[PDB]
Symmetry: T
Subunit: 149 residues, 12 copies
């Protein structure tokens, strides 16, 4: 599916509802709403749209991936903590044959504790952006636009 | 309990809703409904019944195992990705003193990525079947039948 | 906040709803209701109160930490199996800048299987109590009463 | 080849000659002869026959695997200790392009010492059954019947 | 024995003679004499008494555990660096069939360097308290009073 | 430093001279010259310029990083193989106090051999982009323009 | 059980046929026949006898263990290289419910390459003697004499 | 010894009897008889002769190594699966003080599964040839011919 | 020195003063006094004598090794827990050029927890006896008698 | 390319300029000039020629590999210490689609320190020769001639 | 404290009493009295004095470190075996806020056995000298002189 | 060679050209020219001279080591990053039979990141100084004076 025919799904993992309010020295002062506005504006320059959601539940993220599999033109995901722990989210992305996927981490996870250096999502994601702040979501939208188109 | 007095609980973990539709070269073309039918038939030959369920949610699965503990004669479980990650599911099964438990994986997890090699559920499960396709749920039900006697 | 102005949050993870009914040789014969009343009594001696809650869902536990972050004077948490697996809960606790946190394990996890030896919550909790039975929750309450003062 | 045209090879590794006589609390009280009768009955239901053998010698199992490659419709194997140590049996199975293979462990190896958790044979076997008692051989035979048709 | 018939032994390992004077940002500004008074006060509320000691010698701590084995109603020990290195102290504790033992760490060792994550003593202690400051000794004494009854 | 005042240094590691001519199924069919023209246009859209270079020599890349430290407004680097092996290139980037740095890998290294999973450069780079093909370079340029702004 | 009723089985692993002729600086200059005479005289001092055997074949050693299980009063075994690799010989000795077993190594394996530091036989052997030369076989016969009486 | 006075022992391990017939994409379509004729021809060009043998049995291989020790001018060995597992064949080779030994693998073991990467025989062999197909056997003969001379 | 000219030093590590009194299911019911009487009798049969000591202090053990280096004909040591942790005791035995040394463990350490499998002493000991009960000391005496001759 | 159309590139890594002068007990007394002569002679027997070079610089070896890719019929390489550390030389050889490549080590690396046991080059090289001395270079030339022919 | 006002504590761990007498091929033929004279001399050239001590006992070492903390200008320590095992001695040094500490090893521990590779003291010592013979004590003293300055 | 007949080679690895200008809080504010003057002065007191160089290039350092091998009295080397990565420079130094080598690290590498803990150079260097600042190079010069004397 192309960007003209279906939205880009933009998924956000656990604790991201507090972006811009908690640990600003690590994740910045922009909020999740500010990030949704960036995404909308980047997709509109390519003639696309976005479906932007956040959840703290692993299984709800699994369900939204299944939805995107049939209805969306690609997926930009910041799995947050679940990057490091969820084989179930990996597996949900693996049922999405050929759908473009870009993983995004606001912080540079390779500079932080060793438990954050590995992500299960990365083994499926076509592209992985880390430590580019909320600008990384925009890079994700632009990479989907290049892959879908 | 016996098979005549209570149903066998058949539990299915994340992504199993898309069985037969996704990655058929790994997991085959039979659907979850097809699997449910195989189970009903095998339990019937032993004078028993099944209670077949699927969920994406780790905590829902926990809840269902608590229910089984009191109302079912045994559990046949395919924990899917949660086999590799859920200490919480293992611990739910450990509350079920003496209840027969059979773990089933459709694919042969020992030929796949190393993160798939280990299951938490397997330390509590009485029996473990892997790589026997959807026929391994039939083996599951048969083994519950033998043990519930 | 202070103990006079807001309740202490007391959070229990998965399977702890069965406390006193299952595996009494490991976890004792006192119920979760029994624990709650111990907590209510200990907080009352310091002029405080408690908000006592259990869940089998990782994401609901995250949401209740976020609620504590704004409305409670500290957290006493028994993550149960999530202690071992949940980076998400650790991250939720991390968003709570300066809020006193005390982790509690009923059993001595250090004498159990090696997968129980490490907890994600312990890198954030101020204090960790293990193997002091349900009396560890009273210790927890007593320590938050000291830290809040 | 088919079950009607050639027998199913049933191979048993070292120490299995003492089945039913030794360590009954781990492996049961049914003998190797009892297992052979279970196998003969299971295959006859599908119009097939079995060739059941046991050896303490690694090279003799490799020789038998080579024979089956030419004359048998599939192989049901309990390699016993050899599971954990024999790259030479794994390799013999690897020469049998397309022959159905099912590996059987009477006990649940995943609940035992860590040196028993890994099996060389499992990387080639199509299916792997563990902890289903001697009933696991019957599973084996039924799985070959499905694959050889 | 019982708290009315024998004292609780309170043992302190190496460098705790400088408590209050060195590294106050990690271990606080209360002294070992201050901790002794808190212990004395807690035990007297249960009609008990304490026998409070410190040593920088591994062999001396071993000899004091032998003494406790015969003359004391239980042991509250803060092994200090010996927690991480001393199989001999673990083994002395192991000779004390059934005597209640609570291990205390002033600091939350789980947040410090990885060599401080493991403790030998923890596999024998009944209970372990970490990161609750000098108040953990009062928790120790309370636990021993509950067990000794 | 501003984009107006000095060029962005774009550094490419060993073997990138052959880009578009070798292993096109992993690294694409665009040439290194093609990447250089993408970079010049990306920087131009922010009023900036680029200094694009490639080398098979680890010490030469070290020397170019020192040069950048004094004369450039940031560094986009694709270390190629040296990402995995060069402590010396990490240390050269460590000399560059506060200079924006973005590391780019054409291919998604996290899907490839395990020796490619770790990069010494990622511990210093502000941002890391992998698996976005040659478009990653454009992202790299954009992030430097936003960090230099 | 008694030395009077049945001989002590003395089993020697692979390459022990060459003892005294190969690598004398590691294993000495006494031959295997010289060891057999030592073992005859040691057993004679207790009123017993020996049945002394050597094989390069893992399976043959398994079959002699099963023989011993029924007809001998204990086993002294030097598994030679099979100590480090044979799960099969371990398993054969585990079928020997209560039979006294002593493992002997001529050389001190703990001083040699790391692959020699672990023995599978040592988890079943009641006693293990290493680096006492051919005199270790006399020790083994004395230990069996003490265990049988 | 010399090539004019004694034959070169050429030994082949388990499954090599099927060379040319099984997994031809890995090991080639030349048979073990074709290999023997290559070896005869190479040895004759140096005035020498070969003694070519194959076996699936580890113990037999050990026995043949013992024969060579006394009767042959060197050993070219393809230990096949027993390269990875047999400490016993290593130790047989170690009894052969000074005898030239060359280990040959038809496939390039270093490109295959990690369990194939280590050979116990490589620590004693003088030279090791891998991935040169059946010509590697000719290289082994030529090397034995330079070392005997 | 010889057995006629100097005694055999027999050193016992921490907690062995309680032998016969604590953990009799693991270490037996004979006391340290009974073990010294065994040693005296065994030494006397070879015309030697013994100097039998025990300490809980690692440094004292070091001092007594030093003393043996000058005044005794060999050392039999049971290092007890310091087996596992004392590089200092290893190093004291390394200063003893050529002095016979035999290490003895009453229990079969290879069947106990993984922290007990490694001994620093065994890389220096000429011989190592484990799991032969108190009889292990007599085998120690006998080995020093053969080595000092 | 055929051997008649283009030379075989023979590449030598760091420190091989001193071959025959340093550590002769490890690498022999033939020089690098001696080695080139051997190669010229072996190539000439197959109607071919060689291009023999040596370099201490990783980048220069990468550049020469690039040259060979276009102008040579195959490569024989002794990467010397770069075997163990150069991902960059491995990737240079990966750009050479279908070019025959044989890695040569003069010493038997597998007998040396464990850092020398793994080579990055070996995952790409078609054939690997180790411990055949400078004769291994002739084997390399011979293999190239067979693969180009 | 300055060198003029207080002596430099020179500390020596276990077995060092035998320096010059034992293992001279590793540690040399100079004695501990020789090393003290070298320290006195080097301190004298800076107007300083030394307090040179040796002990086999870990806790004595800790006690002397506490004395230095209050009465000495700095510590030069050779912890000997306790380097590898003593967290207690590292924690003693860590109580000495800002006191200059230099760790010395006579032998180059990095060329020896792997258990010697790691030092606990090294994480706190300001400088670490290894393999420079007894001259490394002189280096110690000189460094203390520069840092107390 | 003596210090009177030949200069001491002082080699400095990558990034050292910015000593004193970069990361002064780790490496100090003295420049490389200041270090060379300290070495010239130390050598002059022994009647010797220095030959002080720096390079970013691994192979140029190998070349310089080859020079020193024939023309210099010894080598003082700060390999810098290449300490951790270069088996090539290790090997270069291994060609220098009997030449005194001292390795120096300005900063205390044991307190930094774990990839800095190991040095390949340290397995050949006679002595190793770390964390003594730039005064460590004077220690180096002094140690070569003693060894060449
Ligand atoms: O950088 C991110 O956005 C990530 C967000 C989190 O919540 C962490 O758990 C991840 O580790 C990193
Ligand atoms: O084979 C199965 O049924 C399993 C199904 C999945 O969903 C995976 O997550 C498991 O790894 C395996
Ligand atoms: O002791 C406790 O309360 C913990 C309770 C749980 O449920 C386990 O999962 C933890 O491992 C231990
Ligand atoms: O359970 C089985 O049948 C196996 C039987 C054996 O003998 C063991 O060695 C295996 O580990 C397990
Ligand atoms: O926190 C405590 O009381 C401990 C005190 C010590 O001295 C350290 O050795 C331990 O690691 C921690
Ligand atoms: O993907 C890239 O651009 C990098 C390209 C290289 O050359 C490889 O060496 C790296 O592993 C990946
Ligand atoms: O010491 C012995 O008797 C042993 C003899 C062998 O043959 C070795 O394989 C063992 O490793 C040790
Ligand atoms: O390459 C060969 O000749 C080898 C052949 C065998 O049979 C294997 O088991 C080895 O792993 C490789
Ligand atoms: O078996 C013995 O004598 C040993 C005695 C001890 O005290 C233990 O610490 C050892 O682990 C074993
Ligand atoms: O054997 C040789 O040719 C190799 C040559 C080198 O220089 C070493 O670095 C390698 O490790 C071995
Ligand atoms: O080199 C030194 O001075 C050391 C001396 C000791 O006694 C050893 O224990 C150390 O490992 C090293
Ligand atoms: O401390 C030194 O001088 C070292 C200097 C370097 O450049 C680092 O790379 C080394 O890790 C440390």
């Amino acid at each position: 599916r192309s960007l003209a025919n279906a939205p880009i799904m933009i998924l956000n993992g656990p604790n991201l509802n507090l972006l811009g309010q908690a640990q600003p020295e690590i994740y910045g002062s922009d909020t999740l709403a500010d990030v949704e506005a960036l995404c909308v504006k980047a997709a509109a320059a390519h003639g696309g749209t976005v479906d932007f959601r956040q959840s703290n539940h692993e299984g709800e993220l699994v369900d939204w991936i299944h939805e995107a599999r049939l209805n969306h033109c690609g997926i930009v995901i910041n799995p947050a903590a679940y990057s490091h722990t969820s084989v179930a989210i990996l597996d949900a992305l693996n049922t999405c044959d050929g759908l473009p996927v870009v993983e995004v981490h606001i912080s540079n996870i390779h500079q932080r504790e060793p438990f954050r250096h590995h992500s299960y999502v990365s083994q499926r994601a076509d592209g992985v952006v880390a430590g580019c702040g909320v600008q990384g979501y925009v890079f994700g939208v632009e990479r989907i636009a290049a892959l879908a188109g």
